């Protein structure tokens, strides 16, 4: 099974993520299970950083 990304971290891909990366300087991930989105900036998502 694939585990949720920890709080303050975001999945590297919108679907079928392979690694979890920390939110960069100046960003913050409130919720766990954050994931990046290709649309818009590559460092943010609907719940991402």
């Amino acid at each position: 099974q694939c585990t949720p990304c920890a709080a303050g971290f975001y999945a590297n891909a919108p679907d079928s993520a392979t690694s979890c990366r920390a939110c960069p300087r100046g960003y913050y991930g409130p919720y766990s299970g954050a994931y990046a989105d290709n649309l818009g900036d590559e460092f943010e998502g609907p719940r991402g950083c």
């Binding site: 585990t3 920890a6 920390a22």
Partner: peptide, 25 residues
């Protein structure tokens, strides 16, 4: 004969990574 028991759950998940003008004449 009775059926065998169920296997023990896997170990805990891993943690997370770290961080002056001149005077007049």
């Amino acid at each position: 004969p009775p059926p065998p028991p169920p296997p023990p759950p896997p170990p805990g998940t891993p943690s997370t990574p770290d961080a002056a003008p001149p005077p007049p004449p």
